[PDB]
Amino acid sequence: TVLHVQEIRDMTPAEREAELDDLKTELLNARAVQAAGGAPENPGRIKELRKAIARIKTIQGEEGD
Amino acid sequence: TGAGTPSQGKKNTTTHTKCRRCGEKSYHTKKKVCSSCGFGKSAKRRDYEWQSKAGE
């Protein structure tokens, strides 16, 4: 959602990898918050993070990195 | 020493196991042959026409 495909294609092979290691981390910091019986969660995003990263990896494929 | 109950005691040997190839507990870790799929014996899947009635 917050991250649309178009926006991903309007990135540079660098921006993608950067945006990538950024999501990967927001992901980790959610799994952490959840691993600690944390309730400040919002299941609607820890799901998106995965998807987001999916797309990004999907684009990296198409664009040839 | 009766062959019934009494002789059931020593039965603490491991033989048949979760075959790596099929997923059935038929891998005889002693012969290393799957009584179910033929793994370890045949590269082809163990099968027989008698595992079903003659006209079926």
């Binding site: 600690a36 019986g37 944390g38 309730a39 400040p40 | -």
Partner: protein, 35 residues
Amino acid sequence: ETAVKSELVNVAKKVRIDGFRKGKVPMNIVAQRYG
């Protein structure tokens, strides 16, 4: 001592949260807050 958390402090003794034995919980793990 705490007029903002005495109702949060005096909880740790009766919280039984996942992974932690009654009363042996780090207060900032009990950092979960409502009200």
